[PDB]
Subunit: 494 residues, 4 copies
């Protein structure tokens, strides 16, 4: 604990003395100006920058962990971290620090992404060095330098894969509680990399899946609409071609359904979230899974000699058509607006329907208290009749049942004022404010949904080809601690 | 009056002369540098800052009273008052200046709170001293001071209670006209202290009360819905279990009602405001009280052999369900929205309904002037028929009564244009502007409502336990004008 | 024209040379630094500052006329005008320049107000001088000057009257096209003077008129509602007391009506605007006049043995109730909101109803040509049926008339989409934006309406008493070009 | 390629040497401080500023082309371009640089306008020079200089025409994809020139065309409404005057229609856009053309012994009335608002109706799956019944068909909540946001529509008169490189 007491004292000069009898903690938790530059040139023994702390984490992992996304902190942090790392690298050219993973098995780039970081993530991905024997750690390179025309290349190592994972997967597949999961896709390379991956392959296949899905939905809808009318399914088939077409439609329907069942469940088992993200996010897959569940229940009942298979079936069909909106991602205007609707439903409907339902139940049960007979005596019907005022078909004399029509009318009028004049207009105004406040979150989430689409298409891809690399076997430096050549698949930007 | 002339003239040197033959007023009303620094060093006798003025108020009470809570005033005021405090402490270590109450029986902290103060209130609550043997008047302390990690403690004396009252009660139970009753709860200690008290005990008890209330309301609703149908209450009971269940429901209903009656009335007799806070504030308790009044009237009629107990009863039931919204305080998303609605009704309904009612009455009486017969001849029915247009069931040919259908149609069309197309859209737009105007005040008022909940739960609490103290008997200073130790219940923040 | 060439050339040295052989134009149109100081202090003959130009206007009138309400212009203008005028006052202390009116018969203050000016009007009304022999032109005085406590006076000459008119009348009774007809009431004395005049007398009598008007309207409404039912007015009276009540109501009704007729017409003949203010402004008096016109037509027909007096009468009654909203001035919330409605109708209804009427007429005539028979064949009925879609009672199958029901349905659906889904929502959104745009102007117009109310009450006042002076015979200066005292009924402010 | 390498190296001194053995590229693509001033004074031979590059672009064309509308770049660009051009002009006063056109046959002013440029376009139009023998290139002058009054003339060459085209045509008739086609009319002269041409000539004839069109539309509407009722058109005429009136109406109708046909098609052949403007712009003419097409189809069927000419005719009539809104340009309030509506439809209706139609189709298919009988069995009628909920005539019991009314009601209620409560309010809110987002763009597009109106009227004009010139044969300089006088039709600006 000699360094613990030493940095507790934190005197600028005595550090050159106490070392005569954890450096990672000194550089990380404190980041003093003099200590970090001197720990590698101690009079007893210098500090091993590549070494691990008491749990196994290296210097870079703590250096990342400390940084906390504040401007004045960040301005200091970038320069201090860059200087200590370039000194440590020039001194020990044989080894690289960022490739060794922490206790959890994550690189410093992966940790920075998972915790959710901007200045650090940007710094790690966009490192630029313009000195010989110091390009060993750089990522940004320049080839052309005109007055008006500037171009550059990025290696993008570990953004496709470091053979375990990639930073893009980490940003996209965060826990959904990360403060800045969306903003991390605003870095210089990732936006254009996603854009090129969209331009190349993902755009066409995504629209293809959309067209296939539309045909699937049409086929299912046709199969439903011409369903038979007799009781006790399944039904004896005749050799008339109509039965063959209908059976074709049913078979395609259930096949597509269980295919979606497998796609959803295999998504789930590929992450196993602890019931957090399933409600914070992941709605788009949950809904398709629910569709598949309903389809299967329907066919189970269909073979089970039950009439009510129709009841299950239609729900899926309804849900099926609604889930068409899932594909509105991929379009500049449509997808953003659809996500805006989905977020407005999720944010608003619970809180609104609570108030509205309190009022409806209160006034409905009040009025059904008032009226009596030996109809509208039922609570359900009166709940409907007071509902109808919200769709603009309220009656104001929906019964003639006596016993104090005066208070009856007073109650209806108060209900109307509360619900139809005051509450709904208030809802409209709140939705207006919500919209004006969520324009930007809608843009972000649309970009994220595109990122998810691209990642799924590349990850599954079901063809085993190499249709992922950016720009071929481009040689960039050729000046490593060894004199060997390099091929690292850089990407050109202008 | 030699001091009066001295400070009315404000000559820098002659002040040493007139004193050779009120210092509180001198330091308070003007706050000059030489006056404040010089009244303690007079050639005849120095000023006794602990003494009382002509009415009984001490120096600090006037020093608070003069303060006006503006920025450029605030900085100089803080400096001068801190100098006053440190000089008084060092010179008169035997006693403390702020503990003596004024004529009204209020401390300087209480007076600053009741008037409504931010800079002054914050200063009084967060005094800091950086000298040994002068911590006697400190309230802010430090324990851990790293580069990135800082933590501190606050004594919080008189925020829970000084055995008569506390500053938190003063802020929360202000006169409801104080300009900044809400903003005063955003200071460093009170916000976190309320948050902690919410976390510890109040949250569970409040939710429990909510669940109990919901069960009460359900019980009452059930009792109402299955009320008997015969005339002339009360009704003979039979040994059938249904009658005992109904009687159980009625008994629980009236018991809960009169319990709320006592809760409301006991609140009132604990304040008895002179109609100021009664109407700008205290809406929830008035509403619950009104519910209980209606319940009791229903009981009275029920025993009084009157059928009209139904009419009274339902009103309470209606009000009962509405008052369920009271509990939406305590939920970050819901309660703010509920308060926003309540404020919108209060601000808007009078002004809107005035215009709408003028139009409705004018056109109803105009049209019923026009039409005649030997129905819709009545004013009431025509008031309804012109009402119906605003719920989207207007008819435009609701009668065939002759005598100038041309002007009749002209009148209806003008009414529709004024009311249905112009006025309602105008209402919607105004709510749209009002919402964006009141978002922040709504946040403040919800925080205030939670504060009221916390205070009510803690003060009554019906257990006689000590479930109020923050962090146990923590010793903070131990260096008093005497050498005795201290225990003051500090609270840690960081 | 020697001086115009002199000041076009504007060389500093030739100024004293050329004057060896109009100065108002020189000082006014150009306002050079050196020239104006010499023109009154020439070695040959100085210029007469009190003189008139070729049309009769004095120096101050041109000095006002030049100023054009720009910040950098204004900063220069205030200093140059104040210095040249104080120099002229010192040189010619016997006479005052501002009292002589221009060719139009207006004082410099009146001209500044009529053109609509802020810095200039504020300067003219709020002159402050703190030197002996220079208070002769001051209008602002100070009595108490502490840090926080200030107390002062305004003389306010010509704000009550200069025996022809006052500045407040000029501001309020402008031509309604003046750019600053509203903002001119934001000066220091006028706002408080209006407030005090409101507090003193105008508030009570205005509310009294309001109560009287309400009683008048109720009386009229009652008289209308129980109108007789037989044909051929007037009707023989019986000694039944009901006839006497009705005749009382009619007599009071027509008396109040013709009284309003005289009030409106006497307002008009008291200004005779050239159709400019009559349409951009003066809406209230036009409406009251129209009410009275309808009343008169009704009584004419009533004696003329015509039934149609009913048709006229009701219109007035309808208009009468609408004009109730006129009195919403005087209230902090209500009047502003009423003005917002009136402005919304005025600016919006023409533009909206144009689009809506184009669509309605186009689709209605399209459908009515489509359908045919040997009803809905009429254009009017179909105009109604397509109207009903806007109030939410459209039918979509209002006719079974054949001949291409397919295009018929296409047309109705297109109409619905254009009008009911798109146009009305667009109207709502535009009303929202307009409301956000007119948030501040409405307060100005309400303050102006109060100013109009106060001015009318003081103008008529029907008592002949002297209940108008501000604050008694307060002595202010005592140092004039003569050594006499001063009593001018200045006003106290703090 | 000697200069390519020379300007790749960009050495400040070696330029005096390398020239001993393209300058249009050197000045433009790089714009170095030293090179451009020295290229005209080389020791071997100076650069010919008037020369053309390998394709035919002059120095000005490249100088324009490089500029890319950035503020700091533009500040540099103005001074560098002005200095090089004035030096080159003073050296070669015989020739002018702007007159020779590029490879495309455009002047540098026209090219700057077509690409869409502000600083450069403004510079080219508003050049000012304050030196003798250097005003030869100026466009802005000063002729009057008083204290308050500054006024001048503008030459405005090529703004009316350079005998091929003009800058105003280029700005107005851009490709519709230019980033700033509308902002470019904010330059100093063009706004006032459009205002003047409006004031003088275009206003009257435009309103005249509007009145003529209105009469045309009325005539056609009357002709339609009294159309015959017998089958098998055309119909035998009788000499009754009514038939001649109707035939007059028909003849006027078809004549106006085919005139519009020729108008639209001749406009098209005068541009031949490459399928871009026909979708991003040009709606206001496409719609009139579509009207003409429908009219022609109607007359074809009318002679073709078909009844369906009614079906064609009405559509034109419907479209005809809608196209009335075309003339709302020319009005300060109306035109802006109409264009706002047109943009709202174009931007919003596709995206909204997609979501709405997905929901409607899904739920209609679901319900019609559920219900059956031995009507509402049809998909179409159920599509209508679920439609009606959006116009406020939803029924909630539109059938009594059994088989699981519970899920049926659940489906309808979910539909109502999704469509009538959520989506429709979101439409309203989005229109609310969109309006505030397009407050300012609409003014620009309205000014552009006026510009189109003025240009069309002036270019066609069918009179052969000279009703275009600004201010007569005004002489500007009279001091050319030759000693000849000048007459260039300047315009007076105050």
């Amino acid at each position: 604990t000699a360094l613990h007491i030493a940095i507790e004292r934190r005197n600028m000069t005595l550090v050159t003395l106490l070392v005569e009898n954890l450096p990672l903690s000194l550089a990380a938790c404190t980041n003093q100006l003099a200590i970090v530059k001197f720990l590698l040139q101690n009079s007893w023994q210098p500090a091993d920058i590549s070494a691990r702390d008491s749990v196994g984490n290296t210097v870079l992992h703590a250096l990342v962990e400390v940084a906390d996304n504040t401007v004045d902190n960040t301005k200091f942090v970038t320069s201090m971290y860059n200087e200590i790392l370039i000194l440590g690298a020039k001194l020990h050219p044989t080894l690289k620090l960022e490739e060794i993973t922490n206790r959890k098995g994550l690189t410093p780039l992966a940790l920075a992404a998972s915790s959710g970081k901007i200045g650090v993530l940007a710094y790690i991905l966009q490192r630029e060095i313009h000195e010989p024997e110091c390009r060993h750690l750089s990522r940004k390179f320049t080839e052309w330098a005109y007055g008006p025309v500037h171009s550059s290349l990025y290696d993008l190592s570990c953004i496709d894969t470091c053979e375990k994972n990639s930073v893009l997967e980490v940003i996209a597949y965060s826990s959904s509680e990360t403060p800045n999961r969306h903003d991390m896709l605003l870095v210089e390379p990732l936006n254009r990399l996603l854009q090129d991956k969209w331009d190349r392959f993902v755009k066409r296949i995504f629209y293809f899946n959309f067209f296939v899905y539309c045909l699937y939905m049409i086929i299912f809808t046709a199969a439903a609409y011409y369903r038979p009318v007799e009781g006790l399914p399944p039904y004896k088939l005749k050799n008339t071609v109509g039965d063959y077409f209908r059976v074709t439609g049913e078979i395609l329907s259930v096949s597509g359904g269980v295919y979606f069942f497998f796609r959803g469940i295999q998504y789930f088992l590929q992450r196993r979230p602890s019931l957090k993200s399933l409600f914070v996010d992941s709605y788009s897959e949950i809904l398709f899974f629910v569709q598949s569940l309903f389809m299967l229940v329907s066919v189970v009942l269909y073979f089970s000699q039950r009439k009510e298979y129709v009841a299950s079936m239609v729900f899926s069909l309804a849900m099926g058509w609604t889930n068409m909106l899932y594909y509105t991602r991929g379009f500049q205007q449509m997808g953003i607006y659809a996500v805006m609707i989905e977020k407005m439903i999720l944010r608003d409907l619970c809180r609104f329907m609570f108030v509205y339902l309190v009022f409806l139940f209160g006034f409905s049960t009040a009025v059904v208290t008032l009226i009596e007979d030996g109809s509208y005596n039922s609570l359900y019907s009166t709940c409907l009749e007071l509902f109808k005022f919200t769709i603009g078909m309220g009656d104001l004399e929906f019964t003639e049942n006596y016993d104090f029509k005066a208070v009856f009318i007073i109650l209806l009028l108060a209900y109307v004022i509360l619900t139809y004049i005051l509450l709904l207009n208030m809802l409209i105004a709140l939705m207006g404010e919500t919209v004006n406040k969520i324009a930007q979150e809608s843009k972000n989430i649309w970009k994220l949904q595109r990122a998810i689409t691209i990642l799924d298409t590349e990850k599954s891809f079901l063809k085993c080809m190499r249709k992922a690399f950016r720009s071929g076997k481009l040689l960039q430096v050729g000046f490593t601690p060894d004199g060997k050549d390099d091929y690292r698949w850089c990407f050109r930007v202008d």
